[PDB]
Amino acid sequence: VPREQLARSRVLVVGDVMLDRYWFGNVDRISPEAPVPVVHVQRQEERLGGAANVARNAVTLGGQAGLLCVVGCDEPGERIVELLGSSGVTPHLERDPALPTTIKLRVLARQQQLLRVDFEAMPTHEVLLAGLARFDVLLPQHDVVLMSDYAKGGLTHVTTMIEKARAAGKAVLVDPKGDDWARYRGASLITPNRAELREVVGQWKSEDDLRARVANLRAELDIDALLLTRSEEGMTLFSAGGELHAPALAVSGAGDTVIATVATMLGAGVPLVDAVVLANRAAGIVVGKTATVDYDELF
Amino acid sequence: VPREQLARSRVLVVGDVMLDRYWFGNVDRISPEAPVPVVHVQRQEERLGGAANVARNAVTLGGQAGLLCVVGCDEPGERIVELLGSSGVTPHLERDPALPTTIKLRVLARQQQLLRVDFEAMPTHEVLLAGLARFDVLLPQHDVVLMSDYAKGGLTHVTTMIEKARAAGKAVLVDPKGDDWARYRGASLITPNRAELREVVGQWKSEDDLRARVANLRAELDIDALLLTRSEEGMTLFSAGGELHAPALAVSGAGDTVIATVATMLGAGVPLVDAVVLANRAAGIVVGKTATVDYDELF
Numbered sequence: 307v308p309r310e311q312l313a314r315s316r317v318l319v320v321g322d323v324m325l326d327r328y329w330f331g332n333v334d335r336i337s338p339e340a341p342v343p344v345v346h347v348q349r350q351e352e353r354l355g356g357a358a359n360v361a362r363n364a365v366t367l368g369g370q371a372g373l374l375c376v377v378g379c380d381e382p383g384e385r386i387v388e389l390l391g392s393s394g395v396t397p398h399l400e401r402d403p404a405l406p407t408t409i410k411l412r413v414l415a416r417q418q419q420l421l422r423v424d425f426e427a428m429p430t431h432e433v434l435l436a437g438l439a440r441f442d443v444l445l446p447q448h449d450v451v452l453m454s455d456y457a458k459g460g461l462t463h464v465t466t467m468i469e470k471a472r473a474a475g476k477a478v479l480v481d482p483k484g485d486d487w488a489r490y491r492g493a494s495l496i497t498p499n500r501a502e503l504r505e506v507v508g509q510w511k512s513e514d515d516l517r518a519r520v521a522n523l524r525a526e527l528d529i530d531a532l533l534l535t536r537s538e539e540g541m542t543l544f545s546a547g548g549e550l551h552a553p554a555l556a557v558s559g560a561g562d563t564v565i566a567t568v569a570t571m572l573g574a575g576v577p578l579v580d581a582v583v584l585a586n587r588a589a590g591i592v593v594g595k596t597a598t599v600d601y602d603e604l605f
Numbered sequence: 606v607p608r609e610q611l612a613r614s615r616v617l618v619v620g621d622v623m624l625d626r627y628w629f630g631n632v633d634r635i636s637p638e639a640p641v642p643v644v645h646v647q648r649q650e651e652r653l654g655g656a657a658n659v660a661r662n663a664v665t666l667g668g669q670a671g672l673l674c675v676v677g678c679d680e681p682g683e684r685i686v687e688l689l690g691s692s693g694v695t696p697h698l699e700r701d702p703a704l705p706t707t708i709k710l711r712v713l714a715r716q717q718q719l720l721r722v723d724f725e726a727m728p729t730h731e732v733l734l735a736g737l738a739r740f741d742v743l744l745p746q747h748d749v750v751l752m753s754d755y756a757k758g759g760l761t762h763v764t765t766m767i768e769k770a771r772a773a774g775k776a777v778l779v780d781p782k783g784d785d786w787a788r789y790r791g792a793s794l795i796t797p798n799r800a801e802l803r804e805v806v807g808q809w810k811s812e813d814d815l816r817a818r819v820a821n822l823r824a825e826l827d828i829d830a831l832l833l834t835r836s837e838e839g840m841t842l843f844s845a846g847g848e849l850h851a852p853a854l855a856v857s858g859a860g861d862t863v864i865a866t867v868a869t870m871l872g873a874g875v876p877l878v879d880a881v882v883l884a885n886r887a888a889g890i891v892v893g894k895t896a897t898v899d900y901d902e903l904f
């Protein structure tokens with residue numbers, strides 16, 4: 307794929323944005339107030355998480371990406387904005403002064419976690435409808451929409467967003483979250499892993515059992531295709547015209563990398579099966595480094 | 606004491622400033638990455654700590670207070686500045702862009718601590734000498750100096766500061782920290798508790814044993830008086846002209862309250878024994894509420 311063909315590939319990433327933050331410290335003593343460790347923090351690292359990382363991958367492959375999401379009026383909010391600007395992602399953020407920007411803080415010492423700390427809230431109804439209005443404006447400016455769900459509240463109106471995108475002839479990719487997929491109704495492609503697929507469809511016993519177990523799930527959800535990631539076993543694309551398997555070639559943030567690759571490819575006008583094939587090579591690489599596959603490495 | 610007599614009582618608080626911060630959250634699940642709790646934080650509280658709280662008490666009694674200390678060029682730095690301005694304390698901060706502002710973060714859930722997190726560093730030699738220069742300028746503008754030690758690095762040059770203050774006929778009060786008190790040499794009054802006194806002087810068996818155990822410690826440190834706080838047993842002022850005991854009348858931040866009261870009183874020109882007496886009443890109150898005794902309650 308010419309780097310100028312996918313240069314005009316426009317992907318609109320929509321969903322839950324967050325900041326993955328880490329504190330590394332030393333624990334030498336116990337607190338005088340409680341029977342708990344004391345962590346003298348020596349350094350802090352951070353990277354874009356959630357939908358933000360998904361959008362990060364579309365750019366490094368040579369394409370363009372936009373991020374429709376909600377942040378708060380706080381420090382991590384400012385930080386995401388800065389981190390977005392320095393990664394090539396066009397930001398389309400709604401600000402909720404009452405919302406804390408989603409952040410997952412890990413506290414570590416001796417290369418071991420002691421605690422995880424979350425900051426998160428449900429966006430106000432007012433804010434969500436504002437974003438939905440932005441989606442209307444942003445839709446025509448893009449070739450494919452990517453729904454990155456993390457159950458934080460950003461994809462409350464995903465069903466509506468999907469039906470608007472499909473009505474404009476734009477593909478809708480969904481990175482799932484949870485056991486309720488009724489909201490993903492009408493989506494072009496949905497990309498769960500083996501664990502994620504179960505809780506919706508249950509456990510199975512043969513690729514012929516899994517085969518039909520996927521067929522009806524696609525049939526009752528107006529979902530045209532399902533891309534099942536299987537780690538060691540590779541991927542399987544269940545498209546109603548057939549199936550396509552792709553083995554590995556060699557771990558974190560790989561799910562973000564595969565759906566971003568498929569999205570940016572489709573936007574570049576490359577066929578689905580080819581897009582899925584490329585998503586496998588991109589997958590085989592980021593597991594060898596979070597990471598973002600460049601244009602030079604993929605081809 | 607007329608509220609206009611102590612209105613012109615000027616206390617220069619010097620030492621380690623910090624921010625006491627608290628996170629209250631809910632813990633419902635275990636992290637997918639580690640066998641550690643996940644704390645969804647719902648609210649945050651904070652108050653001035655260290656030397657800052659000591660300076661806070663001098664103002665609420667009607668007097669004036671100044672704070673010579675070191676903060677960093679960060680968020681908690683800004684926060685202390687704001688918290689100082691809204692408490693009546695004249696700030697005299699040195700900024701160290703390489704230093705993290707000292708903060709003690711408690712994470713809690715279900716009214717129970719899970720972890721404490723510290724941010725702290727040693728001030729650069731350059732910064733410490735800058736502050737010492739400020740002390741020279743600030744000394745004449747005050748009636749009494751208060752050394753609030755927390756072993757964070759702010760009182761590296763305390764011995765010099767003490768000998769300069771005493772040379773100008775200004776009292777020097779010391780709130781101790783640790784087993785090395787050789788640095789407090791030349792101080793007017795030093796205010797440890799029973800636990801703090803031991804590690805320097807060891808354990809004792811009779812007020813006559815403790816009596817002489819204090820006498821020599823005062824004699825080898827050019828320290829004129831020691832105010833021993835004994836909780837339930839009250840206080841004892843060991844001044845070489847005699848002793849003075851003051852029983853309780855009825856818990857946290859009480860040590861800050863007693864030494865602040867003594868300091869602000871001496872600055873108002875009230876005698877030592879009277880100042881110590883008043884420090885007992887101030888003590889008997891804050892244990893009934895951190896807290897700051899007002900002028901209306903003390904008298």
Ligand SMILES: COc1cccc(OC)c1-c1cnnc(NCc2nc3cc(OCC(=O)O)ccc3s2)n1
Pocket residue numbers: 499501535536537538539540541552553554555556557558560561564586589590591593
């Ligand atoms: C995250 O991927 C792996 C993880 C473990 C072992 C692996 O194979 C040696 C892989 C791997 C490496 N390269 N290709 C493949 N095959 C296709 C893929 N399987 C997965 C599975 C993924 O997530 C697994 C999960 O969510 O548990 C994410 C991306 C891919 S891409 N799998």
Ligand SMILES: COc1cccc(OC)c1-c1cnnc(NCc2nc3cc(OCC(=O)O)ccc3s2)n1
Pocket residue numbers: 798800834835836837838839840851852853854855856857859860863885888889890892
């Ligand atoms: C912090 O004070 C108390 C703590 C526990 C019981 C108490 O008596 C009922 C007291 C208390 C209350 N009111 N007056 C007094 N007596 C004089 C004082 N003892 C202490 C002891 C202090 O700290 C004790 C420590 O550091 O462990 C701080 C201030 C005073 S003031 N003690």
Ligand SMILES: [K+]
Pocket residue numbers: 557558559592593594595596597
């Ligand atoms: K990686």
Ligand SMILES: [K+]
Pocket residue numbers: 856857858891892893894895896
């Ligand atoms: K109190």
